Amino acid sequence: NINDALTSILASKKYRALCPDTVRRILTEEWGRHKSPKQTVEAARTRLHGICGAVTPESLKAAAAALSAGDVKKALSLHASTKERLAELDTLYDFIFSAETPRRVLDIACGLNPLALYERGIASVWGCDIHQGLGDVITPFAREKDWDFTFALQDVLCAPPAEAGDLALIFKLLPLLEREQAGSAMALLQSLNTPRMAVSFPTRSEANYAAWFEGGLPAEFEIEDKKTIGTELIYLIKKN
Numbered sequence: 001n002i003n004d005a006l007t008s009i010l011a012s013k014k015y016r017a018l019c020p021d022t023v024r025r026i027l028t029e030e031w032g033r034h035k036s037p038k039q040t041v042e043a044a045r046t047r048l049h050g051i052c053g054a055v056t057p058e059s060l061k062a063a064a065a066a067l068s069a070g071d072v073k074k075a076l077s078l079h080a081s082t083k084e085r086l087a088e089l090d091t092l093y094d095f096i097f098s099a100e101t102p103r104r105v106l107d108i109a110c111g112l113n114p115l116a117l118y119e120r121g122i123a124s125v126w127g128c129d130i131h132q133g134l135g136d137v138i139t140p141f142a143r144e145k146d147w148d149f150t151f152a153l154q155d156v157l158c159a160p161p162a163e164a165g166d167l168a169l170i171f172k173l174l175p176l177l178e179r180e181q182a183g184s185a186m187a188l189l190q191s192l193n194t195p196r197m198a199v200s201f202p203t204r205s206e207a208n209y210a211a212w213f214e215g216g217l218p219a220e221f222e223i224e225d226k227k228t229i230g231t232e233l234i235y236l237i238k239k240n
């Protein structure tokens with residue numbers, strides 16, 4: 001059964017820090033599409049390889065160390081997604097916070113980004129992602145600096161965020177969400193308990209993300225702003 005497999009896969013050194021829901025979700029899908037030789041586990045296993053960062057413990061240790069030495073920048077350099085948004089990082093948050101600076105932010109599929117949020121003087125942050133290694137790095141930090149930050153090992157496709165806040169960050173995620181389960185991308189924005197959200201898509205290869213996002217955004221949402229910064233096309237929207 002699935003629970004047996006989830007248990008085996010989570011035993012591996014390569015996947016032990018993975019959100020159990022994700023492994024299960026993927027196990028379940030690789031089953032109905034196969035009925036398998038049993039080794040659905042293989043399809044799932046190689047599906048989980050690039051389901052997360054493609055994030056090695058090696059980079060993780062390197063981060064929590066870089067971090068413990070005060071070098072936040074480098075810590076961020078050790079995470080792929082954050083590393084490329086690094087150069088135009090400040091321009092990016094000025095764009096986002098320009099109109100209203102949030103007290104509580106909900107960083108969806110946060111990654112190491114929360115660190116960048118600390119250095120922005122954001123008071124409260126709730127971040128979720130599918131790899132425990134991430135929280136392992138940011139929590140001791142937040143603790144060591146009495147910064148109100150909470151990490152949830154959670155897959156937004158099994159359960160949406162139950163938290164509330166002023167802003168929600170959905171950076172380069174909608175595409176991966178939509179590809180895993182049609183219509184789930186917008187469904188995520190609909191269930192986010194925030195009046196504002198910062199969404200983004202990669203500029204490089206919904207061939208045209210702008211045309212898709214703009215074309216499929218629910219009428220309850222409005223686009224207050226749009227701009228490209230570095231490798232991201234950003235959209236500031238408001239939920240009503």
Ligand SMILES: Nc1nc2c(ncn2[C@@H]2O[C@H](COP(=O)(O)O)[C@@H](O)[C@H]2O)c(=O)[nH]1
Nearest residue numbers: 052081109111129130154155156157171172
């Ligand atoms: N919470 C959540 N995170 C996900 C899900 N699928 C992928 N991710 C995470 O989302 C991120 C992809 O965004 P990025 O790091 O490029 O900005 C990765 O950190 C990855 O592990 C999901 O279904 N739920």
